[model samples]
Target: TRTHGLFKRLGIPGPTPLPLLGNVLSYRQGLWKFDTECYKKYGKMWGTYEGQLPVLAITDPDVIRTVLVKECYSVFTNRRSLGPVGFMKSAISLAEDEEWKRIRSLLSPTFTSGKLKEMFPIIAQYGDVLVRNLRREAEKGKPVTLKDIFGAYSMDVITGTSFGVNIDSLNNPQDPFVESTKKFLKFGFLDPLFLSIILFPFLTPVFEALNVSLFPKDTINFLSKSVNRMKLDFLQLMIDSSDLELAAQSIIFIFAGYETTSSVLSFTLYELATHPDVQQKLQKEIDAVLPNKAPPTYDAVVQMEYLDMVVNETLRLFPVAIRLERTCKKDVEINGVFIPKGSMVVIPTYALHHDPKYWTEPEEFRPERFSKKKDSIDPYIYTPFGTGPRNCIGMRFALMNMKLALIRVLQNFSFKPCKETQIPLKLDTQGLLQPEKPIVLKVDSRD
Candidate 1:
């Protein structure tokens, strides 16, 4: 009984939509490939159906700029579909409407550049630990999964930065919080239980009332109690809220902090290990700036142009937040296309990143593409952190975190591709396009 004719009536081009399931079957087969073709065939903007529900996928940079940038954010406030269940109550990412804004305001100060500057030493300290761990692993001379290694390093950074306690997740792999944090991002579109809760809106009240949560409730509770333990804690400023609020916020903070950063860094290391010329060039740049044994400073992080290029290029290829979901707040038109009110909008940022139109040698891992003369790519076309008012609030913080860590690591060690190194990455189709197989590589001390 819902209106499903927006794509049909508007004559927006897309794959054939059959009754009931629409093009759901196609995407379930392989969403990325499906979208790649959809954008290629449909050009810029197209529509697909998730059952009767109409979903619009847009890749046109200018149209995206119009929608994502100001003058239109008011209508595109909600990122994901219009489901008010779960963490929608407090977490900024899932929080909808005005609630998202309020949460964003509260959390904004936590990731401000000034705050991150103050927090830099904590991240740098963990960077040292990351180096030690990698060196310890390197001694064994076995190819280690770089993503898992970096995932732990990321966890230590997040755990240290957010909780003010260095659980040193690299050493403490059995740590309950780290284990639970890994479990948090595990979900699927084809899941029936996930489907039922999402398909039937009424089931939300029951899901919440019965206290079902997709996030790691146990980890949050444990963290909340530990945070409130009255022991030395510096995160009071960051999480001064109720248990329910803190739990939701902590879940998001770790989820955002851990998964995205590690995903990008994993690929960054993979790219570096595979490309010695690029790696050696970056090491040369780092050596020119920072002292041999000194930790990376904010100024040092800023000065390294090559490091910035490598990080930016890594994000370009393996952006962690691949598909961003936004619901149309009001009917809007751009580039001769009409998007109806309440229509579900999907931004295939990953597709745009790989699109041959925006990128030269789109399939290649060329960090030089981001260099001065070679880089004229539009910001919207390569938005790894996303853009607009609802873009990742911690964009600066995450960059600083990654930059500092990479400076420290690359200064102390060089990642080397080994026999097990998965050159053409086998990506996991789940949350972040993580390695479907473990990203095996080797590292040795640089100096």
Candidate 2:
């Protein structure tokens, strides 16, 4: 029994806890605020005794580096808790050990630089549609939700590329897949509760007995049917392929590819709209590089250095996956702390990115930080797509899709913050990232 006093003696710092609940009250009240305060009071590496478990939150970049790269196996080896999204457990994001390795190897070809280059035309096509839609709305002097537009844009790109079927979520906003996906992202009340169950696996059976599902039934139904249909249609293709495992694993791409990219694009647009100067500079760069292109090509997009910086800076500030977690598979010593087997380690990405020590004026939106001149930023400090053995397998594909979409949008339109947009963006605590509220923008055709 690791008591609060025991944890305090061990140098773990946390607010006074209530019996059984531990720090659950503070966690429930405001997780981000609580984490911020903890980091502020406890330094980089400190532990909190939560309920029956002791969780370590590491903010030091060097310590995170050691856990993710240098001493990956010993100190950090387990996957982040994915809650009741059980069907997605097979996906690379949640999978571990042999399963993760197998899936990563199989899906490697789908995200190769060459493969992404080939997929740019598809990405550009979706971007063109999005730009056209925004232009139509702009004609009426209507403000557009850049978040929704970017979400649909990325959805269409991923659905098209991954499944070889054109599911235009942007055009057909009322589609079942689109609607279900949105609802899936908004898990309502069950979201946080389910996450707790995931962190404590012993409660899983009790939860399951109550017939509660972390993932919505509608979402799972849509994905399963879609995957089955894709498999049936490509039966010959699947059979012809030497690697059945690779073809079978394509289903994960349909969801993982769409959601992660869409979320990032949405947040990027929100950041750009809020920061007018950065948006203008990006637009100027796009104009200078691509000229009057309807849909910028892969070559043209690659040349837009400022756009890349803007996107990277946006990611650094508002990462789609805000936290990374790993459990020790074996006993390991890190920064003089001996992490025993099964001990949990957390890397608070948000805190690290916003910390003044690592980034100058960390609160400000400064794309120049990622400029070509400063190409040698600490790799460990910037991991939007994760790092090392368990990094995002679809990094290239996601980047290409994001770049292509942004190029098309920027070339034809200018985005400025709308009244509905919040000054200091507030994240939907329920959602995965720090999602912007009312991410509205006034769109105008580029003059």
Candidate 3:
């Protein structure tokens, strides 16, 4: 009954939905696949239901720009919450109105250009650890699974940068920090509690009364303890700014910083391995910039245009976040579609990235698409770090870390697809965007 004339009232088109389940069952097959299918079938804008929740899917560039940027504060200020409780309740990602603004303001100064320069050496040192680990893997003369190494590296960088602790996850994969962080990122679409929340959002207060949380309590408790013990960068800033939500903020930092960066690194390596020319081209740029294989200064890293292009292309082809969503703060019509207050707007990142209307040969891995002198790209259509005020706060930080790692790794070695490589890369739709199987590649010393 939830779907009965619901979308019809909004004058939106979508597949007929069933009862309380709505379109949740359709997306259970795969978020990416279902999103793509819907886009192809319904064009840039359509309506769907996730449980009883009415979601308006929009990929229209103008509407995207309007919602994400122009009227961001006035009409679309908060993301749709999944009824997260406790530590997650204080997270900036899900926080609303003045709370989001204040926390974001307090944290913004730490991610500025000047602060990133100070943190560059911290991230670069971890890149050295990555290189050392890869050196050992190359010596083994066997294919290396990319995600584990990248995951470990991402963990180290995030820990070092956010917590100011040198946990060194790469060397100690079994470390509790490594173990718990990995366990926390294993969220699936089919999680019973998650499905329950989707199917019966009205029961959120009941789940809260039962002390059920959206994230794993054990993982949160362990990380909270670690955070209590743990910084100059983000943690220090948060502590200096406000300690009431310190652990909550720190946990969100790790959650945001770790898995997403690792996924990007994994896919970038896979692309470089599969495309030898791009790998070589990237190495040539690195060679020009840091001939002695010394750690790159922040300015030097920023100057590597080809490296930026390669990373940009990787993000375009393999955006880790499938969709970026916002909840309507006020009633508004965008691009002829009526969005009522309290409705959810879904911006399908993967679908837009792969849409043939916006991209030429949208499946290809050509870095030239990002090269300067090409046609100008529409910002809304190519948002990897998102657009507007509420975009990823650590966008530059993540970029610096990833570019530093690639520079270090490519300076000493090259990646080649081997027997274990997954051709075309089968994706896991259960969670965030990532390869279903480990992305394996043979590492060879460039020497």
Candidate 2 accuracy as TM-score:
0.88
**Any runs in candidate 1 off by more than 4 Å, and if so which?**
1-4, 82-88, 197-202, 230-234, 239-243, 334-336, 373-376
lDDT over C-alpha atoms for residue 362 of model 2: 95
- Sequence-dependent TM-score of model 1: 0.92
Instruction: Report the Cα lDDT for residue 275, model 3.
Output: 93
Note the residue pairs that clash in candidate 3. Answer: none
For residues 152-192, what per-residue lDDT tens digits would candidate 3 score against the true structure? 88988887677756676867778887778777576656578
For residues 159-214, could you state the per-residue lDDT of candidate 2 as single tens digits? Answer: 56655555667677678767765654553234666547634556765665675656
Comparing 1 with 3 on TM-score, the higher-scoring candidate is 3
Q: Give the candidate number with the greatest lDDT.
A: 3
Q: Number of the top candidate by TM-score?
A: 3
lDDT of each: 0.73, 0.68, 0.83
Least accurate 10 contiguous residues by lDDT in model 1: 230-239
> Model 1 lDDT vs. the true structure?
0.73
Which residue ranges in model 3 land beyond 4 Å of their true spot?
Answer: none
2 or 3: which has the higher TM-score? 3
